Design a protein around this ligand. Structure first.
Ligand SMILES: Nc1nc2c(ncn2[C@H]2C[C@H](O)[C@@H](COP(=O)(O)NP(=O)(O)OP(=O)(O)O)O2)c(=O)[nH]1
Ligand SMILES: [Mg+2]
Ligand code: NA
Ligand code: NA
Length: 327
DNA sequence: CCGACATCGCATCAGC
DNA sequence: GCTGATGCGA
DNA sequence: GTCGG
Protein backbone atom coordinates (compact mmCIF):
# COMPACT_ATOMS: atom_id res chain seq x y z
CA UNK A 1 0.00 0.00 0.00
CA UNK A 2 1.33 3.43 -1.02
CA UNK A 3 2.59 6.06 1.41
CA UNK A 4 -0.08 8.74 0.73
CA UNK A 5 -2.63 6.19 1.99
CA UNK A 6 -1.73 6.43 5.70
CA UNK A 7 1.73 8.00 5.48
CA UNK A 8 0.61 10.85 7.67
CA UNK A 9 -0.12 8.40 10.47
CA UNK A 10 2.90 6.15 10.07
CA UNK A 11 5.22 9.21 10.10
CA UNK A 12 3.49 10.33 13.27
CA UNK A 13 3.95 6.87 14.68
CA UNK A 14 7.63 6.49 13.76
CA UNK A 15 8.33 9.93 15.17
CA UNK A 16 6.65 8.94 18.42
CA UNK A 17 8.65 5.70 18.31
CA UNK A 18 11.99 7.50 18.11
CA UNK A 19 11.22 9.88 20.98
CA UNK A 20 10.29 6.89 23.13
CA UNK A 21 13.58 5.13 22.33
CA UNK A 22 15.92 8.08 22.34
CA UNK A 23 14.45 10.48 24.93
CA UNK A 24 12.17 8.51 27.27
CA UNK A 25 14.29 5.31 27.01
CA UNK A 26 11.09 3.24 26.75
CA UNK A 27 12.28 0.63 24.27
CA UNK A 28 9.06 -1.33 24.55
CA UNK A 29 6.95 1.69 23.66
CA UNK A 30 9.37 2.22 20.77
CA UNK A 31 8.63 -1.28 19.52
CA UNK A 32 4.91 -0.73 20.15
CA UNK A 33 4.82 2.42 18.00
CA UNK A 34 6.67 0.53 15.25
CA UNK A 35 4.40 -2.51 15.38
CA UNK A 36 1.46 -0.16 14.84
CA UNK A 37 3.26 1.91 12.19
CA UNK A 38 4.06 -1.31 10.37
CA UNK A 39 0.62 -2.91 10.57
CA UNK A 40 -0.83 0.41 9.46
CA UNK A 41 1.60 0.85 6.56
CA UNK A 42 0.24 -2.45 5.16
CA UNK A 43 -3.42 -1.57 5.65
CA UNK A 44 -4.76 -0.98 2.12
CA UNK A 45 -7.37 1.67 2.97
CA UNK A 46 -7.21 5.34 3.90
CA UNK A 47 -8.04 5.26 7.62
CA UNK A 48 -11.07 7.45 8.38
CA UNK A 49 -11.12 7.10 12.20
CA UNK A 50 -8.98 5.95 15.09
CA UNK A 51 -11.61 3.35 15.85
CA UNK A 52 -11.13 1.90 12.38
CA UNK A 53 -7.41 1.59 13.15
CA UNK A 54 -7.95 -0.05 16.54
CA UNK A 55 -9.17 -3.18 14.75
CA UNK A 56 -5.63 -3.86 13.67
CA UNK A 57 -3.40 -5.99 15.90
CA UNK A 58 -1.07 -3.74 17.81
CA UNK A 59 -3.15 -0.59 17.49
CA UNK A 60 -4.77 -0.11 20.87
CA UNK A 61 -6.69 2.52 22.80
CA UNK A 62 -4.12 5.27 23.09
CA UNK A 63 -2.86 5.24 19.49
CA UNK A 64 -6.46 5.18 18.23
CA UNK A 65 -6.95 8.45 20.13
CA UNK A 66 -3.90 9.93 18.44
CA UNK A 67 -5.30 9.00 15.04
CA UNK A 68 -8.50 10.87 15.93
CA UNK A 69 -6.55 14.00 16.90
CA UNK A 70 -4.44 13.80 13.75
CA UNK A 71 -7.47 13.26 11.52
CA UNK A 72 -9.33 16.21 13.03
CA UNK A 73 -6.46 18.67 13.28
CA UNK A 74 -3.64 17.40 11.06
CA UNK A 75 -1.25 17.40 13.98
CA UNK A 76 -0.50 16.01 17.45
CA UNK A 77 -0.11 18.61 20.22
CA UNK A 78 2.28 16.40 22.21
CA UNK A 79 4.49 15.86 19.16
CA UNK A 80 4.51 19.53 18.16
CA UNK A 81 5.56 20.60 21.65
CA UNK A 82 8.27 17.94 21.82
CA UNK A 83 9.48 18.78 18.29
CA UNK A 84 10.06 22.33 19.54
CA UNK A 85 11.80 21.22 22.77
CA UNK A 86 15.50 22.08 22.58
CA UNK A 87 16.65 19.34 24.94
CA UNK A 88 14.51 16.45 23.69
CA UNK A 89 14.94 17.28 20.01
CA UNK A 90 18.72 17.63 20.44
CA UNK A 91 18.89 14.32 22.35
CA UNK A 92 16.83 12.65 19.64
CA UNK A 93 19.07 14.00 16.83
CA UNK A 94 22.53 13.07 18.15
CA UNK A 95 21.41 9.43 18.31
CA UNK A 96 21.65 9.50 14.52
CA UNK A 97 25.41 9.36 15.05
CA UNK A 98 26.14 5.62 15.05
CA UNK A 99 27.76 4.79 18.38
CA UNK A 100 25.63 7.34 20.23
CA UNK A 101 22.56 5.76 21.74
CA UNK A 102 19.98 7.33 24.08
CA UNK A 103 22.32 7.21 27.05
CA UNK A 104 25.33 8.98 25.54
CA UNK A 105 23.14 11.47 23.67
CA UNK A 106 21.47 12.54 26.92
CA UNK A 107 24.83 12.93 28.61
CA UNK A 108 26.14 15.06 25.74
CA UNK A 109 23.07 17.30 25.90
CA UNK A 110 23.37 17.53 29.68
CA UNK A 111 26.77 19.18 29.26
CA UNK A 112 25.46 21.30 26.39
CA UNK A 113 26.79 19.36 23.42
CA UNK A 114 23.83 19.45 21.04
CA UNK A 115 24.97 19.50 17.39
CA UNK A 116 27.55 17.89 15.11
CA UNK A 117 29.56 21.07 15.49
CA UNK A 118 29.43 20.54 19.22
CA UNK A 119 30.59 16.95 18.71
CA UNK A 120 33.42 18.14 16.43
CA UNK A 121 34.68 20.62 19.05
CA UNK A 122 34.72 17.82 21.67
CA UNK A 123 36.29 14.82 19.93
CA UNK A 124 38.08 13.71 23.11
CA UNK A 125 34.70 12.85 24.68
CA UNK A 126 33.85 10.35 21.93
CA UNK A 127 34.80 6.72 21.84
CA UNK A 128 36.32 5.15 18.74
CA UNK A 129 32.97 4.02 17.32
CA UNK A 130 31.48 7.48 17.86
CA UNK A 131 34.31 9.24 16.03
CA UNK A 132 33.91 6.94 13.05
CA UNK A 133 30.14 7.50 13.02
CA UNK A 134 30.71 11.22 13.41
CA UNK A 135 33.26 11.13 10.58
CA UNK A 136 30.78 9.41 8.28
CA UNK A 137 27.51 10.89 9.55
CA UNK A 138 26.24 11.82 6.07
CA UNK A 139 27.69 8.80 4.24
CA UNK A 140 26.01 6.42 6.67
CA UNK A 141 22.50 7.65 5.81
CA UNK A 142 22.99 7.32 2.04
CA UNK A 143 21.72 4.06 0.63
CA UNK A 144 23.69 1.62 -1.50
CA UNK A 145 22.46 0.89 -5.03
CA UNK A 146 22.61 -2.77 -6.09
CA UNK A 147 25.18 -1.90 -8.74
CA UNK A 148 27.58 -0.75 -6.03
CA UNK A 149 26.67 -3.78 -3.87
CA UNK A 150 27.57 -6.08 -6.77
CA UNK A 151 30.89 -4.31 -7.22
CA UNK A 152 31.33 -4.69 -3.46
CA UNK A 153 30.45 -8.40 -3.64
CA UNK A 154 33.08 -8.82 -6.37
CA UNK A 155 35.81 -7.46 -4.06
CA UNK A 156 34.70 -9.41 -0.99
CA UNK A 157 34.25 -12.79 -2.66
CA UNK A 158 37.51 -12.41 -4.56
CA UNK A 159 39.69 -11.38 -1.62
CA UNK A 160 38.14 -14.06 0.62
CA UNK A 161 38.91 -16.87 -1.87
CA UNK A 162 42.38 -15.37 -2.32
CA UNK A 163 43.10 -15.80 1.40
CA UNK A 164 41.90 -19.42 1.46
CA UNK A 165 39.97 -21.12 -1.37
CA UNK A 166 38.10 -23.17 1.26
CA UNK A 167 36.30 -20.25 2.88
CA UNK A 168 32.65 -19.88 1.98
CA UNK A 169 31.31 -16.34 1.97
CA UNK A 170 27.70 -15.35 1.34
CA UNK A 171 26.51 -11.75 1.14
CA UNK A 172 23.19 -11.91 2.99
CA UNK A 173 20.80 -9.16 4.02
CA UNK A 174 18.39 -7.41 1.70
CA UNK A 175 20.91 -7.70 -1.16
CA UNK A 176 20.51 -11.47 -1.16
CA UNK A 177 16.75 -10.88 -1.49
CA UNK A 178 17.16 -8.99 -4.77
CA UNK A 179 16.64 -5.62 -3.05
CA UNK A 180 17.25 -2.85 -5.56
CA UNK A 181 19.10 -0.85 -2.91
CA UNK A 182 20.64 -1.80 0.45
CA UNK A 183 21.38 -0.10 3.74
CA UNK A 184 24.64 -1.92 4.48
CA UNK A 185 26.48 -5.08 3.45
CA UNK A 186 26.14 -8.28 5.49
CA UNK A 187 28.73 -11.00 4.91
CA UNK A 188 28.61 -14.45 6.43
CA UNK A 189 31.88 -16.37 6.46
CA UNK A 190 32.56 -20.00 7.28
CA UNK A 191 35.42 -22.49 6.83
CA UNK A 192 35.82 -26.29 7.02
CA UNK A 193 38.15 -26.15 10.03
CA UNK A 194 35.57 -24.28 12.12
CA UNK A 195 32.73 -26.25 13.71
CA UNK A 196 30.63 -26.15 16.89
CA UNK A 197 33.11 -28.47 18.63
CA UNK A 198 36.26 -26.65 17.40
CA UNK A 199 42.14 -20.79 14.57
CA UNK A 200 40.91 -17.45 15.99
CA UNK A 201 42.79 -15.92 13.03
CA UNK A 202 40.13 -17.11 10.57
CA UNK A 203 38.09 -13.93 10.71
CA UNK A 204 41.08 -11.66 11.37
CA UNK A 205 42.80 -12.90 8.23
CA UNK A 206 39.84 -11.97 6.02
CA UNK A 207 39.64 -8.47 7.56
CA UNK A 208 43.39 -8.05 7.06
CA UNK A 209 43.24 -8.86 3.34
CA UNK A 210 40.33 -6.47 2.80
CA UNK A 211 42.18 -3.78 4.68
CA UNK A 212 45.30 -4.35 2.62
CA UNK A 213 43.58 -3.94 -0.78
CA UNK A 214 42.09 -0.77 0.72
CA UNK A 215 38.52 -2.00 0.71
CA UNK A 216 38.06 -1.68 4.49
CA UNK A 217 38.85 1.81 5.72
CA UNK A 218 37.88 1.85 9.43
CA UNK A 219 37.00 -0.62 12.18
CA UNK A 220 34.01 -0.12 14.50
CA UNK A 221 34.45 -3.39 16.39
CA UNK A 222 36.27 -6.67 15.89
CA UNK A 223 36.48 -9.99 17.68
CA UNK A 224 36.76 -13.64 16.80
CA UNK A 225 33.32 -14.08 15.23
CA UNK A 226 31.88 -10.62 14.46
CA UNK A 227 33.37 -7.70 12.54
CA UNK A 228 31.74 -4.26 12.21
CA UNK A 229 33.47 -1.80 9.93
CA UNK A 230 33.54 0.62 7.01
CA UNK A 231 34.38 0.05 3.35
CA UNK A 232 34.55 1.98 0.07
CA UNK A 233 34.84 1.12 -3.62
CA UNK A 234 38.00 2.32 -5.38
CA UNK A 235 37.41 5.62 -7.09
CA UNK A 236 36.59 5.43 -10.80
CA UNK A 237 39.67 7.40 -11.99
CA UNK A 238 38.98 11.15 -12.39
CA UNK A 239 35.33 10.49 -11.43
CA UNK A 240 33.88 11.17 -7.96
CA UNK A 241 34.35 9.27 -4.66
CA UNK A 242 31.90 6.65 -3.54
CA UNK A 243 30.44 6.91 -0.06
CA UNK A 244 31.93 4.92 2.77
CA UNK A 245 29.59 2.01 3.55
CA UNK A 246 28.76 -0.08 6.59
CA UNK A 247 29.99 -3.64 6.31
CA UNK A 248 29.71 -6.51 8.77
CA UNK A 249 31.56 -9.81 8.44
CA UNK A 250 30.82 -12.64 10.79
CA UNK A 251 32.34 -16.11 11.13
CA UNK A 252 29.96 -19.02 11.73
CA UNK A 253 30.71 -22.73 12.30
CA UNK A 254 30.23 -25.00 9.31
CA UNK A 255 27.31 -26.89 10.86
CA UNK A 256 25.51 -23.67 11.91
CA UNK A 257 26.13 -21.75 8.69
CA UNK A 258 22.84 -22.23 6.83
CA UNK A 259 20.80 -21.45 9.94
CA UNK A 260 22.86 -18.26 9.97
CA UNK A 261 22.28 -17.55 6.28
CA UNK A 262 18.51 -17.95 6.66
CA UNK A 263 18.52 -15.85 9.87
CA UNK A 264 20.68 -13.05 8.40
CA UNK A 265 18.89 -13.07 5.07
CA UNK A 266 15.69 -11.87 6.73
CA UNK A 267 13.41 -10.03 6.51
CA UNK A 268 12.63 -10.08 10.23
CA UNK A 269 8.94 -9.91 9.19
CA UNK A 270 9.55 -13.18 7.35
CA UNK A 271 12.00 -14.62 9.88
CA UNK A 272 9.72 -14.55 12.93
CA UNK A 273 6.91 -15.95 10.77
CA UNK A 274 9.12 -18.97 9.96
CA UNK A 275 10.08 -19.71 13.57
CA UNK A 276 6.50 -19.47 14.84
CA UNK A 277 4.91 -20.94 11.70
CA UNK A 278 6.99 -23.55 12.32
CA UNK A 279 6.77 -23.77 16.04
CA UNK A 280 3.59 -25.79 15.28
CA UNK A 281 5.61 -28.63 13.77
CA UNK A 282 7.40 -28.98 17.13
CA UNK A 283 10.51 -27.16 15.91
CA UNK A 284 12.30 -24.09 17.23
CA UNK A 285 14.97 -22.28 15.21
CA UNK A 286 17.38 -19.65 16.56
CA UNK A 287 20.23 -18.27 14.46
CA UNK A 288 22.41 -21.29 15.22
CA UNK A 289 20.46 -24.57 15.12
CA UNK A 290 17.14 -26.32 14.56
CA UNK A 291 15.94 -28.73 17.23
CA UNK A 292 12.76 -30.74 17.89
CA UNK A 293 10.19 -30.03 20.58
CA UNK A 294 9.60 -32.08 22.63
CA UNK A 295 6.61 -33.69 24.21
CA UNK A 296 6.66 -31.80 27.49
CA UNK A 297 8.87 -29.23 25.77
CA UNK A 298 12.45 -30.43 26.10
CA UNK A 299 14.35 -29.49 22.95
CA UNK A 300 16.42 -32.33 21.52
CA UNK A 301 19.95 -32.13 20.21
CA UNK A 302 20.34 -29.97 17.07
CA UNK A 303 19.39 -31.72 13.76
CA UNK A 304 21.98 -31.69 10.95
CA UNK A 305 21.80 -28.89 8.38
CA UNK A 306 23.75 -28.83 5.09
CA UNK A 307 21.73 -26.31 3.06
CA UNK A 308 19.34 -23.45 3.57
CA UNK A 309 16.85 -25.84 1.97
CA UNK A 310 17.03 -28.45 4.75
CA UNK A 311 15.45 -26.16 7.35
CA UNK A 312 12.47 -25.90 5.01
CA UNK A 313 12.24 -29.70 4.80
CA UNK A 314 12.08 -30.15 8.57
CA UNK A 315 9.14 -27.71 8.65
CA UNK A 316 7.44 -29.29 5.61
CA UNK A 317 7.36 -25.77 4.20
CA UNK A 318 7.89 -24.93 0.54
CA UNK A 319 11.40 -23.64 0.04
CA UNK A 320 11.20 -19.90 -0.55
CA UNK A 321 13.71 -18.08 -2.67
CA UNK A 322 15.35 -15.11 -0.90
CA UNK A 323 13.60 -12.93 -3.49
CA UNK A 324 10.13 -13.78 -2.16
CA UNK A 325 10.99 -13.10 1.50
CA UNK A 326 9.79 -9.65 2.56
CA UNK A 327 7.19 -11.66 4.50
C1' DC B 1 -3.77 -6.22 37.31
C1' DC B 2 0.38 -6.74 35.79
C1' DG B 3 4.32 -8.84 33.12
C1' DA B 4 6.30 -9.78 28.38
C1' DC B 5 7.69 -7.62 24.54
C1' DA B 6 14.77 -10.97 19.85
C1' DT B 7 18.89 -11.84 21.11
C1' DC B 8 23.75 -11.58 20.69
C1' DG B 9 28.97 -9.93 19.98
C1' DC B 10 31.81 -6.53 21.31
C1' DA B 11 33.59 -1.99 23.64
C1' DT B 12 33.56 0.39 27.65
C1' DC B 13 32.11 1.14 32.37
C1' DA B 14 31.46 0.11 37.42
C1' DG B 15 33.15 -2.44 40.96
C1' DC B 16 35.98 -5.19 43.32
C1' DG C 1 44.39 -6.94 37.22
C1' DC C 2 39.64 -9.62 36.51
C1' DT C 3 34.57 -10.18 36.25
C1' DG C 4 29.99 -8.57 35.42
C1' DA C 5 26.85 -4.91 34.01
C1' DT C 6 25.47 -1.77 30.64
C1' DG C 7 25.29 0.52 26.17
C1' DC C 8 25.17 -0.11 21.53
C1' DG C 9 24.02 -1.65 16.64
C1' DA C 10 21.32 -4.65 14.11
C1' DG D 1 1.68 1.09 24.37
C1' DT D 2 -0.56 -3.14 23.40
C1' DC D 3 -1.78 -7.66 24.29
C1' DG D 4 -3.23 -11.31 26.93
C1' DG D 5 -2.45 -14.76 31.17
N1 LIG E 1 16.64 -5.31 12.23
C1 LIG E 1 17.12 -6.43 12.77
N2 LIG E 1 17.49 -7.47 11.99
C2 LIG E 1 17.99 -8.60 12.53
C3 LIG E 1 18.12 -8.73 13.87
N3 LIG E 1 18.62 -9.94 14.11
C4 LIG E 1 18.79 -10.55 12.94
N4 LIG E 1 18.41 -9.73 11.96
C5 LIG E 1 18.49 -10.22 10.50
C6 LIG E 1 17.27 -9.78 9.66
C7 LIG E 1 17.86 -8.87 8.61
O1 LIG E 1 17.10 -8.99 7.41
C8 LIG E 1 19.25 -9.47 8.43
C9 LIG E 1 20.24 -8.45 7.82
O2 LIG E 1 20.60 -7.40 8.74
P1 LIG E 1 20.26 -5.85 8.41
O3 LIG E 1 21.36 -5.11 7.68
O4 LIG E 1 19.89 -5.21 9.84
N5 LIG E 1 18.63 -5.87 7.57
P2 LIG E 1 18.63 -5.87 5.82
O5 LIG E 1 19.99 -6.08 5.25
O6 LIG E 1 17.62 -7.06 5.35
O7 LIG E 1 18.09 -4.45 5.30
P3 LIG E 1 19.16 -3.28 4.92
O8 LIG E 1 19.35 -3.39 3.29
O9 LIG E 1 18.41 -1.84 5.11
O10 LIG E 1 20.45 -3.33 5.67
O11 LIG E 1 19.67 -9.82 9.77
C10 LIG E 1 17.76 -7.74 14.73
O12 LIG E 1 17.89 -7.86 15.96
N6 LIG E 1 17.24 -6.54 14.19
MG1 LIG F 1 21.93 -5.31 4.83
NA1 NA G 1 -6.72 -3.97 18.56
NA1 NA H 1 22.96 6.00 16.98
Amino acid sequence: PQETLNGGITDMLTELANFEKNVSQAIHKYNAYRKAASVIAKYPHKIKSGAEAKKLPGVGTKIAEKIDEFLATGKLRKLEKIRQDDTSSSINFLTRVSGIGPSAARKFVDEGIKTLEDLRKNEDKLNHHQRIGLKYFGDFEKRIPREEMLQMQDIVLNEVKKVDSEYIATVCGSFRRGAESSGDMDVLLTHPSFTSESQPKLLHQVVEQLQKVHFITDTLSKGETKFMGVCQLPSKNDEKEYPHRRIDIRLIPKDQYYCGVLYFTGSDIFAKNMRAHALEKGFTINEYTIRPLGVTGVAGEPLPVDSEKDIFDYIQWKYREPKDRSE
